[PDB]
Design a protein around this ligand. Sequence first.
Ligand code: K08
Ligand code: K08
Lengths: 196, 197, 198, 197
Amino acid sequence: NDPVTNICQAADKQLFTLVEWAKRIPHFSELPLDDQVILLRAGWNELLIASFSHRSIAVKDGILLATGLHVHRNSAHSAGVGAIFDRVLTELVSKMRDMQMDKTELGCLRAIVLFNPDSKGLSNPAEVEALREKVYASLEAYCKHKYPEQPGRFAKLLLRLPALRSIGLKCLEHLFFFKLIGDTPIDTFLMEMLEA
Amino acid sequence: DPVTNICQAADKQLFTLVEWAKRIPHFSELPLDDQVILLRAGWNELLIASFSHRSIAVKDGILLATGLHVHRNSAHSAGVGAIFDRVLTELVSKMRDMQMDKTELGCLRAIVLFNPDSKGLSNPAEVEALREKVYASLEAYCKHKYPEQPGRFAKLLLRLPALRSIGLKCLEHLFFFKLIGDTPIDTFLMEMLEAPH
Amino acid sequence: PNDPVTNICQAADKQLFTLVEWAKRIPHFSELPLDDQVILLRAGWNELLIASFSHRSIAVKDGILLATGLHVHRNSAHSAGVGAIFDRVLTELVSKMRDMQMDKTELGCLRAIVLFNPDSKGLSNPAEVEALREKVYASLEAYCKHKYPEQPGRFAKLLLRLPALRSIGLKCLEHLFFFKLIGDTPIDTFLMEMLEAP
Amino acid sequence: DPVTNICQAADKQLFTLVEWAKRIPHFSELPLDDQVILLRAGWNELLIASFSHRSIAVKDGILLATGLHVHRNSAHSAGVGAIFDRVLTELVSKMRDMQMDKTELGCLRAIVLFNPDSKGLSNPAEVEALREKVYASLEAYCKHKYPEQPGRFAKLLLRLPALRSIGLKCLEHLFFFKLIGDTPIDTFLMEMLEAPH
Ligand SMILES: CC1=C(CCc2nnn[nH]2)c2ccccc2/C1=C\c1ccc(C(C)C)cc1
Ligand SMILES: CC1=C(CCc2nnn[nH]2)c2ccccc2/C1=C\c1ccc(C(C)C)cc1
């Protein structure tokens, strides 16, 4: 009934999904708790974007949110975030589709993103760089075994990260996720009050 | 818990705003989708205008509606100090020095509300006509309430560009998040991390 | 020729000077301390420029007429990547100036109000600048009421284009609007000639 | 003139950038419209990558092409202390510590240049294919230069997200203007004021 509160609840649930995921990554929970907070704050955007972009591989012209919401271009443009939507489709989803990025590869990429040594305030960044290195070593080993005819695949996966970074910035800037899940609930709320 | 309080308080502020808009003469005569466009386009400036005027009783700080006081120290610490000082020096102090009264504030807000430039309006001309009715009322008010201050009406209108730019800066730099949403997110996260897995 | 940025700078240089020459003609402006004059010009230059070319562009439909003679159309503005800001200028300023037939006296007054901006950071004496601003808008009001007595709402309507000018000014500075407009083509040209060149 | 200095310096950098691109294998075989697009999409990151690597021999400062040495003092003074520190911590110091050499730098810049995401590219796939050739070559080089660092190749590619956000932040904050254009403009304006009448 109360739109902002419902939106926050949805944000709450989403963020907790991410926290549980990170705790299942080997060695994340062994890091200091402050450093864990720092990594999740620094990374939550790209992590969520990476996640919903891969999920949207099977669908036409849209984004599947973890909330179940199926966002089309029209809706995204209605919410004032059509440009960013387009970029997600073009630079992430379609490229994920085209190379058939699998779930193991996505997880490794998200774990790389999570273990971001550049995150400000890290008591021990070198330690975080070292976890990231273990992760990418494993991803490379995986790609070579699973896709031997594709020697450049590991690098191709790594090279989606600059795109993810810039889209992540734009999403943070324009409150992408919040505008999408909130736009219609706000219109609906407003309309009900305005008619009463 | 901190985050929950913020969301509820936002929901309350949104409620009060819509109720205020409905009592504005002729607002409800507009097509409902236009009323919605206007409220969504105006909420930020409308809010900044209110808390600025409410803050004239305070030195170098701001009063958000729930008796929540924020000092410029906290703004500067959070990295939004320059913006906070623009609120203080371009809105608050100016409102204080001219003794902007509550009728003049209500009019400025109604003018902000009736924004004919808002994208998607089915009829911007009707919105411009409602805006002109409001500023005609305001000019009538100022002339008769303050007949010894001939430039007062204009002075009030000339606080609107400051409101516009401060409004943009606030959103651009996540002013509100950095002031009142930052720490609660840290707390929120720590709790999640400590939760049973 | 062969130095695209230099040429862009010369054009901007010439444009800013037109603004500075206009300001020195505004009564009392040159009586302010020099450092205040510089503060006012830096704070106001973008809005002053936008206001000038917007008003100049009433003479055309769907374009911006620059002081040099360059007529910028929508296609150029789109190529330049600033189509959105371009459309705001046309919609919020040009067409609204046209709708009310804002005249050159009113344009001059509105720009002088913009120049005498008492919120400009660092002014030695902000009240002195507010005092000059107040003189200007009293003159503008008496002018509108004398020239257009049948439009009692005109003065206020003029002032009420200022918030739009403010937001568009911020967007223009942010995306280097003016510089992309006068600079997009010469850059492509310089690049192209170089890439074709042996 | 100081401003005239800056413009001429930028024209120089542009010229050198273009001549560099032409010497990148297969670059000139792309459509000319596509070459222009890539150079325009890439110039900012390409410049930042170069002055960052150039600054490794410099203590607590940044070196711009004309021996223009910029220290933290100036950066903090200009309100861009934060971005300055990012360039040092995320680019300059990481380049230094892993001893990124000019061949690796060259490969990374070429990867940047061959950006298949650039808007308006007539054939994105063609650009992506050139990127892959460049990165295969960079991997081959890392393998023999440091066979005992199997993670060097990936480590190099993983500075590119930092370069991307740094590039965006520099533009958003007018980083270069605030550092080298700010005072010259004051001088320029004062000269304009000294002109007759
Ligand atoms: C728009 C907004 C964001 C979204 C991000 C943002 N955009 N601009 N500033 N912050 C945010 C995030 C956290 C906390 C608040 C906020 C906020 C606005 C707000 C909420 C509550 C109050 C009162 C009732 C206390 C006042 C303003
Ligand atoms: C992009 C840019 C602006 C436009 C505004 C801007 N955007 N991002 N930063 N500044 C500007 C303005 C004034 C002076 C420089 C600049 C500048 C970049 C620049 C120019 C010359 C050099 C030389 C040293 C090779 C280096 C960088």
